[PDB]
Amino acid sequence: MKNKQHVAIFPFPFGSHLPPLLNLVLKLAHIAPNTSFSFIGTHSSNAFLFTKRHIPNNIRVFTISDGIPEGHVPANNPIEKLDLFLSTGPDNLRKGIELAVAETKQSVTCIIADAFVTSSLLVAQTLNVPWIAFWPNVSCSLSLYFNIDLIRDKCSKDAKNATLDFLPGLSKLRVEDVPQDMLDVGEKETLFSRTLNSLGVVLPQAKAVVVNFFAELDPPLFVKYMRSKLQSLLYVVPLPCPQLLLPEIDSNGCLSWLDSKSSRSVAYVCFGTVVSPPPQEVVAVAEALEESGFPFVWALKESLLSILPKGFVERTSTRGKVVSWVPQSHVLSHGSVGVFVTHCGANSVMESVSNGVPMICRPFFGDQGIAARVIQDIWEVGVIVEGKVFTKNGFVKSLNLILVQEDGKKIRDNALKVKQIVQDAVGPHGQAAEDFNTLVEVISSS
Ligand SMILES: Oc1cc(O)c2cc(O)c(-c3cc(O)c(O)c(O)c3)[o+]c2c1
Numbered sequence: 001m002k003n004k005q006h007v008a009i010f011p012f013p014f015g016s017h018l019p020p021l022l023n024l025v026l027k028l029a030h031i032a033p034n035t036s037f038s039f040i041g042t043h044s045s046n047a048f049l050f051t052k053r054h055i056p057n058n059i060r061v062f063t064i065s066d067g068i069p070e071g072h073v074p075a076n077n078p079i080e081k082l083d084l085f086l087s088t089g090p091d092n093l094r095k096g097i098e099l100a101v102a103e104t105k106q107s108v109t110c111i112i113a114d115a116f117v118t119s120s121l122l123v124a125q126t127l128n129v130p131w132i133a134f135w136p137n138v139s140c141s142l143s144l145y146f147n148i149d150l151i152r153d154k155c156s157k158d159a160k161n162a163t164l165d166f167l168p169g170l171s172k173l174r175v176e177d178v179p180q181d182m183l184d185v186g187e188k189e190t191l192f193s194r195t196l197n198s199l200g201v202v203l204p205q206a207k208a209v210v211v212n213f214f215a216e217l218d219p220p221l222f223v224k225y226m227r228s229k230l231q232s233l234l235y236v237v238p239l240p241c242p243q244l245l246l247p248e249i250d251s252n253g254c255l256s257w258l259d260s261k262s263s264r265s266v267a268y269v270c271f272g273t274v275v276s277p278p279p280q281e282v283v284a285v286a287e288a289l290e291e292s293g294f295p296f297v298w299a300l301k302e303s304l305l306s307i308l309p310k311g312f313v314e315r316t317s318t319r320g321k322v323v324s325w326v327p328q329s330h331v332l333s334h335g336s337v338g339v340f341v342t343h344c345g346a347n348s349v350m351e352s353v354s355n356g357v358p359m360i361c362r363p364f365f366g367d368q369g370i371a372a373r374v375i376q377d378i379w380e381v382g383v384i385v386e387g388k389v390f391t392k393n394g395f396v397k398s399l400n401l402i403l404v405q406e407d408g409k410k411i412r413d414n415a416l417k418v419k420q421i422v423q424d425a426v427g428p429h430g431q432a433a434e435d436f437n438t439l440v441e442v443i444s445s446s
Pocket residue numbers: 014015016017078079082137138141179180181182196274365366367
């Protein structure tokens with residue numbers, strides 16, 4: 001009997017959403033090389049993932065429209081390109097299905113999609129195939145989308161530090177931690193925010209929701225709450241397949257530099273690639289790092305080097321490293337690094353907790369506030385920076401708290417505890433090993 005299993009994959013075709021979904025498909029393709037996997041991205045998303053990278057033969061790549069007509073020049077806001085792609089609707093997605101079906105000579109039996117591509121559910125219902133939502137964001141933020149009205153009401157009437165006790169297992173979350181686009185109503189509403197606010201109705205229609213995290217780190221009561229909202233909640237280990245890793249030269253020499261530093265002494269600073277921080281906070285970070293006297297690695301966009309204080313890089317050159325790029329995963333897995341100063345992106349938090357690195361948190365948007373709140377008040381593996389924004393005096397204090405002070409021993413200890421929890425979670429028989437097979441069974445039973 002000919003194997004006719006054909007999984008269509010729909011990533012949210014942007015930056016940090018692309019690698020974790022490729023990582024999952026690679027694992028699925030390795031264990032089911034008889035099954036066809038059709039990865040359907042845009043021209044720019046495909047170039048990002050597959051330019052110089054060898055992929056298994058049962059994974060084929062197809063290209064659909066990015067929603068940007070030739071001639072148009074999107075503004076300098078990270079939402080427009082998202083809205084433009086989402087505006088393409090299911091019809092653009094079905095054009096990717098056409099290219100997949102034509103190539104493989106197989107009708108799609110299953111669809112795995114990033115939860116943000118809500119149009120792919122209509123596609124799944126049209127084809128009558130199971131729809132599997134993939135969730136590479138902050139896991140604990142899944143609960144929010146089932147209580148939008150409760151949250152919108154509380155965010156307008158209650159205090160900003162009021163607890164969201166109506167969320168099982170997430171009573172530490174506050175009004176000020178809630179994503180802004182979830183509260184935005186009317187003119188401020190984007191196609192992106194309207195899509196995210198549809199998750200509470202969209203997600204229960206998914207055959208399975210695959211979370212890119214460790215189930216053992218999430219609050220058990222939150223987990224049970226989500227299992228009560230969904231047909232199936234599956235956790236697959238977010239750690240990279242060796243098929244995903246593209247080994248490259250450490251051009252900056254971060255690791256060689258880190259080897260000359262002592263254990264848990266280095267501050268690693270990075271705000272991500274989507275985040276455009278105010279120049280004054282950028283000035284404040286440099287000022288704090290310099291005053292603190294701690295060794296540091298700061299991954300900073302070169303477009304921001306002119307913003308840096310005069311002589312800062314030159315004066316800190318003997319104890320600090322300011323570079324355009326770092327192999328972050330290798331840096332966070334280095335023993336010299338004592339604190340991760342982060343914007344709290346889901347992947348960065350993942351890499352920091354799995355390596356036992358405490359965090360200084362400055363969330364900017366989205367679900368970074370949820371991550372930061374979990375890091376400080378639940379896992380207790382870090383602190384939100386003093387004042388919610390970067391200042392010289394507040395940041396230095398956070399740096400001193402985590403790195404050297406006895407008042408930060410509970411946090412450094414908790415970071416080691418969490419690392420051990422992760423190491424057992426990724427074991428041969430943690431929850432994810434069982435959940436990975438369940439997902440494989442869903443695909444082979446489709
Ligand atoms: O409220 C939220 C909750 C979430 O989980 C989010 C996750 C995300 O990845 C993004 C996101 C991703 C991008 O690549 C962008 O260019 C951008 O402007 C936003 O926004 C989010 C907003």
